[PDB]
Write a protein that binds this DNA or RNA. Structure first.
Ligand code: A0I
Ligand code: MG
Ligand code: MG
Ligand code: ZN
Ligand code: ZN
Ligand code: ZN
Lengths: 513, 417, 426
RNA sequence: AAAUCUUU
RNA sequence: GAGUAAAAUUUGG
RNA sequence: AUACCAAAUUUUA
C-alpha cells in the first residue's frame, strides 16, 4: 500500500523492528568495517581539507556544564581489581560520582583543571592519575539499538567511560560554538523541518539538488581528523587526550576486549565530524551525515564530490540521489517552492499501549499531521473515530473497565465517541482532558510509572525547594543540607504552611490578570 | 560572581559575629550563610553595615553594582579598600600566604602534551584509499525489479501452503470443535501437560536456520485484527486455548527439558509456539472426531510477540487508503492478474507486514520513496539497495521482502511515474 | 550516613550532583503495556479511584471559540515566545511558600517553533491541532485593537493608531544621555543599569518592568538615581510618525531613536512579528532607531554583524540602509554589540567568503543579492527544466516566489527573491 | 520443535 | 541491555 | 581571537 501512495511515504505506519539478538555480531561487524577502512581499501579516512580558517577558541575560559554529566542513561565503569580490567554497566550519574570519588574533586570542572595542571602522567590526583584515566577512558561496552524503521538488522551502540564523556562534553560544546560562528547557515540546533525549510531557501538559486547521505560515517571519522579539527579550533591538551583515547579504544564484546583503532564508535562526536566538512567549504548545508548541497553543472558536481572525498564524507552511492522538483533532508521532503511535499511523509501509526495512552498518542499524531498539510481535518476526525472504535474493540472487557456512564469512552464502558475538534478545543467532559495532546498524564501512564517505581534501601536527605536564584554549582555537605532543609521548614512554618504548595505557571498567569 | 574567589571569601568571614552571636559577614558562595530570597550583589554581605564586599585584582574589574565595595588586592604587597575597616580585616586575615589561582583556558597546553602527541604519532594511521568514480544514471526500471523478484523466487521457491498466513481466514469450525482440535493437536505432538497448561519441551537443537521459502498469498484475511489481538493476548496466557469470535490460537511456552528438575513456569525470556487453525487442504491437516483443520505453528520470542500484537490493522489500512491509488488484482504469487486476481489479497500482504517482526518492508518502502523522488542515481549502486535478502532470515521476513518487491513492480507496471 | 556512601571520600559535592543522586530510579517493565495494566486489575482500580475521587476535583478548562479564516500556505515556523517569571516575582513567590524548584523552572524565557502550513489575514498564531480550522490564541477597546495592527483601520488621532501625540493609556520609554526615562502620563521615572540590574526608584512600575525585559536586566530599587535634563514632557506633548508594522515580541513599537511606546492592556505580541512579507519593511522602519532586539538570528550575532558590515562596505545607499535596518533588527538593545555599520571594524574574513548569508527567524537572506537589488528591485529566475510539469500554474507578469511554467520560453522556472513577495508595494 | 549460539 | 546529538509535548522537582 | 534540570512520549541523524 505504501508503494501505491500518490505522494511521498516513508512507510512509518507500523512499528520498527524488534530484536533479541546479542550485540556481539553488530559490534564485531562495525569494528571490522572500521579496520578495513583503516587499511585503505573501501572508503577514505584521511582528511586533506584545509581547516586553517577555523577561529581559535584556545583563549576562552574552560567551563563545564555539569548538567550534561549526570543522567539516567547508561555508561561503562572500569575497575582494575587483580590486574584485570572489568567493565560494568551503570548509570551516568553513578559513574560520574564514582569518578569524582576516585579522584578527590568536588566538581567536574575542578577535576578537569587538576588533570590539566599536573606535571607528570604518573602524578596522583587521588586514587588515580592522568595515565590511569587515559587507560580507563578507552574502554567501551557494546549494546544493541532496535526499533529503528528500515533497519532489519539493529545497530550497535557503545557506552563510554565517564572521563571520556567529560572531555567529550567540552570538545563538543566548543565545536558547536565554532559551527555557529563559521557555518554558512547554522543548523546544529534547528529541527528537521526547520533544516528542510532553510535548505529549500538556500538551494533555490541552482538547478540540480543533490539529496545526499554518507555511508560508514562513524567508521570513516579517524582520530587524526578529530585531532586536526580540535587543534584548528584550539582545544589544547584536551583534544590531544581525547584523540589518544579514541585511537586506543577497546570494546568489550561478550567477554573479550577488541581493539578498534579506527572510527569514532557511532556518533560520539557529531559536532566535530560536522565541522570536519563545514570547516573546509561553505557549499553544504549539513549536520552529521546529511547534506543538501546543490549544483548547476557537471563540473560543479565533480567539485562537490571532491570536497566530500577530501573531508572524509564518503558519499553513499546507495541512497544519495539528484532531484530537480524537490529536496529532502532529515526525512523531510519539500518542493522547490518551499511547500511540504504531498503525501503521508513521516506520519507514523500508534501501536496499542493502553485504553487512554493510545487515544492521546493518536490525537497528538493527528494534530501534528493536520497542522501541516498532510491530511485535511475531516480525514483526521474520521481517523480518530475509527481509532476509538478499534480501542473499544480491544479494551472493553471486564479486566479493564466496569463502568457504564455515558461520558466515558466506549472502550471503558461508556457510549461517548468524541469528535477530534471537540476534544481539541477543550469542549469535552473533564475526563477527556487527559486524552488531549497537551493535557495531563493519563491513568495508564500514571499506573505504568507507579509500577516502574514500585520495583526495588536508603535515601539521601531531600534537597528540594531551593531559592530559585542559587546557582547549582555551589558545594553542599551533609550538615549543609540538613541546615538548609531546617531553615526552609522554619520559614514555611512561620507562614503557616505544610509542604510547599505546588506552583503551576499556567494557573498563576491565569490569576494574574 | 566567580568560584575562583569562593575559598578566599571564606577566609574573609572567619568567625566574625555581630549583635552578640549573629554572623557578620555572609559569603555568597556558602549554601548555608546565604540569605534565601535575596539577590546577590557581591562576594559577601556585611549585615552590621548592610553593605556588599567584592574582591578584585589590579586592573581586573568585576561585574558588580557600584554600591558594592571593591577590596582591591594589589599584587605587590598590600590590599587597598575605600573602607578602612575592611582594609584592616583583609590585612589581618590574608596574612597567611593565600593566592588566587589563575583561570584555566580551553586551549591550555599541559606538560605531558608533547609526550602524548609522540605516542599518537607512533600509533597506526589510516591509508588514503581510492577515490570513487561516480556515474549518475536514470533510476532502475521495471526490468530491474523483475530481475530482483525472479532471483528471489529462483533461489528460494515457494511453499505449497500459506502456513500461518492461512490463519487469517476462518477454519470452518465452531468454538468447541476448534478447542478440541487444538488440544488434541497439542496432545498428539506429545506436549507436556501441567497446571492446566501445555508446554513444549526441547533437549537439543540443530543450530541451523529453518527452511526458508516464500508463502503463497491466501485470498483474503478477514480475521487479521482478531488474529493480531489473539497473538497479543497469548503473550502471557500461554498454555491454554484462547478464543476470539471466529478463530482461536494456542500459545505453548518452549522450555528446556532437564528431566527431573525442569522449569515449571515460563520467565520473561521464554519463547512461545503459537498454533493456529485454517481450512484443510495441505500437509498440515489434522483430524479428530470428524473435524478437519490445518494446524499451523509459528515460533516467536517475547519481543516478536509484543511487536506483532500491538499493530493496528484497521487504522493502518485507513491511513494508507487516504491517499492510495487503485489497487490491482494479484494472484497467489503477487503477479498482476486482471482475469483471476483478487484485490483482497492486498489485505493479506498488510497482515504479512504486521507478522514480519523485522519490518524489511519498511526498508523497501524507504528505498522506493527515494526511487520515486529521484532524477539521477549512482550506476549499479542504487539498484543494489533492493537486495535485502542478506539482511533477513526466515519464511515470514523473506515472504514480506518478496511481496514488497512485488508491490514495487506492480506499482511501476500499472501506475508508471 | 548515606552521604558517606554515595560520595565516599568527599565531604562537599555540588548541588547538581546531589539532586541527580536523589532522582528516583525506574525499572522498565518486561511485559507489554496492556499486560502491565491488566496485572492485578491495577488499571481497573486506578480508573475506579479516578472516577470516584480525582475527577470531581479537576477544574473545568475554558472552551476555545475564537476563529479566523485560514488558507493553505508554505510551510512556516510559528514562533511562540512565552516569557518566564521575573526575578522579583520569583523571589516573592518563594518567600510566600511556593515551591522553589517549580518557581525556578518558570524563571526562563521560552522560545519554541511549530511547523504550520496555514496563514491568516492578520498573520495570527494558532492553537495546537487547530491551525487548519483557524483557532487563534488572540482574543478579540478599538484603540487596543488598533495598536497591535501594522495598518489600523480607524485612526484615532494619536500615536497608537497613526501619526499624532500620546493618548492617556500609552506610556513610553526613551534613552537620554546615559539614563532611561519612562513616562506614562501620570508618573515619570528614571532608570539606570549598574552592572547587571536596572536601578530605578520604583521597579514595580509597569514601564520599568517592560524596560527591564527589553534590556534583559534584573529590576532593582535604587532611590539615589536621577537625571539632569528630562525633556520627556515635550516629547509627550509632541507628535511622531507611526511606522506601519506589527508589534515586536516585546509588545512595543519604536517611535524614535532608542524610544518605544507601550500600551497598558497589550501584554505581548499575539502575531508573528517577523515574516517573509514584512521583513524588509520592518528593517526599513528601524533604519536609524538603533538596536531593537526584535528578530532572532540563527547562529552568532557577531558573525551576522560581520557579514552585514562586509556587505555594507560595497553597495548603494538603499542597500546600505536595508543592511543597517537588518543590523538594528537583530542586535539586542544595550548589550556589548556594535550594530552601527559605520563604526564597526571591517572584518577581512567576512569579505573572504564569496556569498554572505544571514538567517533571521527562519528566513535565509543572501546579503550579496540584497546589495545588487534583488529582494526589492528584481526577482531571481532559475530554469528548472525545459518541459512542462503537471499541476503548475503559468508565470504571472510580476510573479511572487514559487514554481511556474513560462510559455514564452516553455520552461519551468523557480522564482525567488521576488519584489512581489518581499516588497509587495500594495 | 522453530523466524535456531536463542528458547537459561 | 539499550549509547551520542537535535526538535517538540507532558509530569515532577 | 573574544564578546533551566531530570524522567516519559513522538519524530529526526
Ligand atoms: N540511532 C542513531 C542513528 C544514527 N547515528 C549517527 O548517525 C550516523 C549515520 O547513521 P546511518 O544509520 O545513516 N549509518 P551510516 O554508518 O552512515 O551508514 P548507512 O548510511 O546506513 O549505510 C551514524 O553512523 C551515527 O554517527 C547515531 O548515532 N544513532
Ligand atoms: Mg548514512
Ligand atoms: Mg539526505
Ligand atoms: Zn499448511
Ligand atoms: Zn489609538
Ligand atoms: Zn524623562
Amino acid at each position: 500500500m505504501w508503494a501505491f501512495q500518490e505522494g511521498v511515504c516513508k512507510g512509518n505506519l507500523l512499528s520498527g523492528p524488534t530484536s533479541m539478538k546479542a550485540p556481539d555480531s553488530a559490534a564485531r561487524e562495525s569494528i571490522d568495517r572500521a579496520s578495513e577502512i583503516m587499511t585503505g581499501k573501501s572508503y577514505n579516512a584521511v582528511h586533506t581539507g584545509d581547516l586553517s580558517k577555523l577561529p581559535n577558541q584556545g583563549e576562552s575560559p574552560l567551563r563545564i556544564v555539569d548538567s550534561d554529566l549526570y543522567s539516567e542513561r547508561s555508561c561503562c565503569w572500569v575497575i582494575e581489581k587483580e590486574g584485570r580490567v572489568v567493565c560494568k554497566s551503570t548509570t551516568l550519574t553513578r559513574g560520574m560520582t564514582s569518578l569524582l570519588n576516585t579522584t578527590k574533586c568536588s566538581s567536574p570542572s575542578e577535576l578537569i583543571c587538576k588533570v590539566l595542571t599536573v606535571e607528570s602522567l604518573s602524578e596522583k590526583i587521588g586514587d588515580t592519575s592522568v595515565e590511569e584515566l587515559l587507560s580507563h577512558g578507552r574502554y567501551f561496552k557494546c549494546a544493541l539499538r532496535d526499533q529503528e524503521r528500515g533497519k532489519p538488522k539493529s545497530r550497535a551502540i557503545f557506552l563510554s567511560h565517564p572521563f571520556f564523556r567529560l572531555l567529550s562534553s567540552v570538545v563538543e560544546t566548543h565545536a558547536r560554538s565554532v559551527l555557529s560562528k563559521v557555518s554558512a547557515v547554522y543548523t546544529a540546533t534547528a529541527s528537521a523541518e526547520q533544516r528542510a525549510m532553510m535548505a529549500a531557501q538556500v538551494v533555490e538559486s541552482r538547478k540540480h539538488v543533490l539529496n545526499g547521505d554518507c555511508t560508514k560515517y562513524n567508521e570513516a571519522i579517524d582520530a587524526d581528523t578529530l585531532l586536526k579539527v580540535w587543534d584548528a579550533i584550539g582545544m589544547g591538551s584536551i583534544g590531544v587526550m581525547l584523540a589518544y583515547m579514541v585511537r586506543r579504544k577497546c570494546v568489550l564484546i561478550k567477554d573479550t576486549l577488541v581493539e578498534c583503532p579506527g572510527g569514532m564508535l557511532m556518533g560520539m562526536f557529531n559536532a566535530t565530524a560536522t565541522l570536519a566538512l563545514q570547516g573546509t567549504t561553505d557549499r553544504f548545508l549539513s549536520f552529521s551525515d546529511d547534506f543538501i548541497t546543490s549544483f548547476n553543472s557537471p563540473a560543479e558536481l565533480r567539485e562537490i564530490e571532491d570536497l566530500l572525498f577530501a573531508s572524509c564524507h564518503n558519499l553513499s552511492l546507495k541512497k544519495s540521489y539528484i532531484s530537480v522538483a524537490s529536496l529532502e533532508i532529515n526525512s523531510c521532503t519539500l518542493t522547490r517552492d518551499g511547500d511540504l511535499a504531498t503525501g503521508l511523509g513521516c506520519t507514523a501509526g500508534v501501536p496499542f499501549r493502553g485504553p487512554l495512552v493510545t487515544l492521546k498518542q493518536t490525537a497528538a499524531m493527528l494534530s501534528g499531521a493536520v497542522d501541516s498539510g498532510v491530511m485535511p481535518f475531516h480525514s483526521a476526525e474520521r481517523l480518530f473515530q475509527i481509532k476509538q472504535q478499534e480501542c473499544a474493540y480491544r479494551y472493553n472487557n471486564p479486566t479493564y473497565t466496569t463502568r457504564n456512564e455515558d461520558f466515558l469512552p466506549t472502550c471503558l464502558g461508556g457510549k461517548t465517541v468524541i469528535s477530534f475538534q471537540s476534544l481539541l478545543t477543550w469542549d469535552c467532559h473533564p475526563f477527556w482532558y487527559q486524552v488531549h495532546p497537551d493535557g495531563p498524564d493519563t491513568i495508564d501512564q500514571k499506573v505504568l510509572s507507579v509500577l516502574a517505581s514500585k520495583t526495588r534501601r536508603t535515601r539521601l536527605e531531600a534537597l528540594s525547594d531551593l531559592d530559585p536564584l542559587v546557582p547549582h554549582r555551589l558545594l553542599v555537605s551533609e550538615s549543609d543540607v540538613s541546615k538548609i532543609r531546617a531553615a526552609r521548614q522554619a520559614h514555611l512554618k512561620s507562614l503557616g504552611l505544610e509542604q510547599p504548595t505546588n506552583f503551576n505557571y499556567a494557573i498563576y498567569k491565569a490569576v494574574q490578570p | 560572581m566567580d568560584s575562583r574567589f569562593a575559598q578566599l571569601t571564606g577566609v574573609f568571614c572567619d568567625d566574625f559575629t555581630y549583635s552578640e552571636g549573629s554572623r557578620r559577614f555572609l559569603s555568597s558562595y556558602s549554601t548555608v550563610e546565604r540569605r534565601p530570597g535575596v539577590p546577590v550583589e557581591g562576594d559577601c554581605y556585611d549585615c552590621l553595615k548592610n553593605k556588599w564586599i567584592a574582591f578584585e585584582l589590579e586592573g581586573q574589574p568585576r561585574k558588580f553594582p557600584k554600591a558594592t565595595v571593591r577590596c582591591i588586592l594589589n599584587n605587590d604587597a598590600t590590599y587597598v579598600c575605600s573602607e578602612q575597616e575592611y582594609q584592616q580585616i583583609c590585612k589581618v586575615q590574608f596574612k597567611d600566604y593565600l593566592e588566587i589561582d589563575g583561570v584555566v583556558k580551553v586551549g591550555h597546553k599541559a606538560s605531558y602534551d608533547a609526550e602524548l602527541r609522540e605516542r599518537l604519532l607512533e600509533l597506526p594511521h589510516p591509508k588514503s584509499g581510492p577515490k570513487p568514480r561516480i556515474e549518475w544514471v536514470a533510476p532502475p526500471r521495471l526490468a530491474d525489479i523483475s530481475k530482483e523478484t525472479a532471483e528471489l523466487k529462483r533461489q528460494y521457491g515457494f511453499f505449497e501452503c500459506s502456513k500461518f498466513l492461512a490463519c487469517g481466514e476462518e477454519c470452518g469450525l465452531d468454538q468447541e470443535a476448534r478447542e478440541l482440535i487444538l488440544n488434541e493437536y497439542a496432545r498428539d505432538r506429545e506436549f507436556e501437560f501441567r497446571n492446566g497448561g501445555w508446554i513444549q519441551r526441547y533437549t537439543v537443537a540443530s543450530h541451523k536456520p529453518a527452511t526458508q521459502k516464500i508463502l503463497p498469498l491466501p485470498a483474503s484475511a478477514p480475521l487479521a485484527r482478531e488474529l493480531l489481538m489473539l497473538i497479543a493476548r497469548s503473550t502471557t496466557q500461554a498454555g491454554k486455548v484462547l478464543h476470539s469470535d471466529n478463530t482461536s490460537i494456542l500459545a505453548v511456552p518452549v522450555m528446556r527439558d532437564s528431566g527431573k528438575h525442569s522449569k515449571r513456569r515460563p520467565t520473561a525470556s521464554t519463547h512461545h509456539l503459537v498454533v493456529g487453525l485454517s481450512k484443510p487442504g495441505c500437509e498440515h491437516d489434522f483430524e479428530f472426531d470428524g473435524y478437519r483443520a490445518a494446524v499451523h505453528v509459528m515460533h516467536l520470542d517475547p519481543k516478536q510477540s509484543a511487536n506483532i500484537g500491538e499493530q493496528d490493522f484497521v487504522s493502518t489500512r485507513e491511513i494508507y487508503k487516504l491517499d492510495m491509488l487503485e489497487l490491482p488484482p494479484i494472484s497467489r504469487k503477487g503477479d498482476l492478474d486482471r482475469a483471476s486476481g483478487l484485490e483482497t489479497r492486498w489485505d493479506v500482504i498488510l497482515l504479512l507486514e504486521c507478522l514480519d517482526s523485522t519490518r524489511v518492508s519498511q526498508a523497501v518502502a524507504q528505498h522506493f520513496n527515494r526511487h520515486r523522488l529521484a532524477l539521477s542515481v549512482c550506476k549499479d549502486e542504487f539498484r543494489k539497495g533492493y537486495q535485502l535478502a542478506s539482511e533477513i532470515r526466515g519464511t515470514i521476513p523473506l515472504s514480506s521482502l518478496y511481496y514488497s518487491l512485488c508491490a514495487v513492480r506492480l506499482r511501476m507496471t500499472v501506475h508508471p511515474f | 550516613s548515606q552521604f558517606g556512601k554515595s560520595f565516599k571520600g568527599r565531604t562537599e559535592v555540588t548541588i547538581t550532583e546531589y539532586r541527580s543522586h536523589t532522582v528516583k530510579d525506574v525499572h522498565r517493565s518486561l511485559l507489554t503495556a496492556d499486560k502491565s495494566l491488566r496485572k492485578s486489575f491495577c488499571f481497573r482500580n486506578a480508573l475506579n479511584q479516578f472516577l470516584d475521587k480525582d475527577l470531581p476535583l479537576l477544574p473545568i478548562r475554558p472552551k476555545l471559540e475564537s476563529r479566523v479564516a485560514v488558507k493553505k500556505s508554505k510551510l512556516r515556523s510559528q514562533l511562540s515566545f512565552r516569557p518566564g517569571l521575573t526575578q522579583e516575582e520569583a523571589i516573592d513567590l518563594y518567600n510566600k511558600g511556593y515551591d522553589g524548584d517549580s518557581v525556578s523552572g518558570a524563571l526562563q524565557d521560552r522560545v519554541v517553533n511549530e511547523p504550520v502550513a496555514y496563514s491568516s489575514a492578520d498573520n495570527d498564531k494558532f492553537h495546537r491541532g487547530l491551525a487548519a480550522l483557524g483557532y487563534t490564541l488572540a482574543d478579540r477597546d478599538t484603540c487596543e485593537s488598533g495598536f497591535v495592527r501594522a495598518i489600523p483601520t480607524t485612526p484615532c488621532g494619536f500615536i497608537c493608531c497613526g501619526p499624532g501625540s500620546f493618548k492617556d493609556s500609552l506610556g513610553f520609554v526613551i534613552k537620554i544621555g546615559e539614563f532611561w526615562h519612562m513616562y506614562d502620563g501620570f508618573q515619570h521615572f528614571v532608570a539606570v543599569e549598574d552592572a547587571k540590574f536596572l536601578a530605578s526608584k520604583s521597579p514595580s512600575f509597569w514601564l520599568a518592568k517592560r524596560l527591564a525585559k527589553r534590556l534583559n536586566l534584573v529590576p532593582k530599587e535604587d532611590p539615589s538615581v536621577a537625571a539632569a535634563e528630562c525633556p520627556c514632557k515635550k516629547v509627550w506633548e509632541a507628535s511622531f510618525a507611526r511606522a506601519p508594522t506589527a508589534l515586536d515580541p516585546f509588545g512595543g513599537r519604536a517611535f524614535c531613536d532608542q524610544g518605544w511606546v507601550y500600551h497598558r492592556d497589550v501584554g505581548y505580541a499575539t502575531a508573528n512579528h517577523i515574516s517573509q512579507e514584512t521583513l524588509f519593511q520592518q528593517a526599513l522602519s528601524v533604519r536609524n532607531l538603533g538596536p531593537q532586539g526584535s528578530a532572532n538570528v540563527s547562529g552568532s550575532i557577531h558573525t551576522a554583524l560581520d557579514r552585514l558590515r562586509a556587505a555594507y562596505s560595497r553597495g548603494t545607499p538603499a542597500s546600505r540602509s536595508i543592511l543597517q535596518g537588518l543590523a538594528n533588527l537583530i542586535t539586542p538593545v544595550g548589550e556589548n554589540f556594535e550594530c552601527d555599520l559605520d563604526k564597526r571594524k571591517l572584518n577581512i574574513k567576512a569579505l573572504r567568503s564569496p556569498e554572505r548569508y544571514i538567517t533571521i527567524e527562519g528566513l535565509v537572506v543572501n546579503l550579496d543579492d540584497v546589495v545588487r537589488g534583488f529582494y526589492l528591485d528584481k526577482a531571481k529566475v532559475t530554469v528548472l527544466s525545459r518541459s512542462k510539469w503537471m499541476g503548475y500554474e503559468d508565470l504571472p507578469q510580476k510573479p511572487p516566489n514559487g514554481t511556474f511554467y513560462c510559455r514564452k520560453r516553455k520552461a519551468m522556472l523557480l522564482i525567488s527573491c521576488s519584489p512581489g513577495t518581499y516588497a509587495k508595494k500594495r
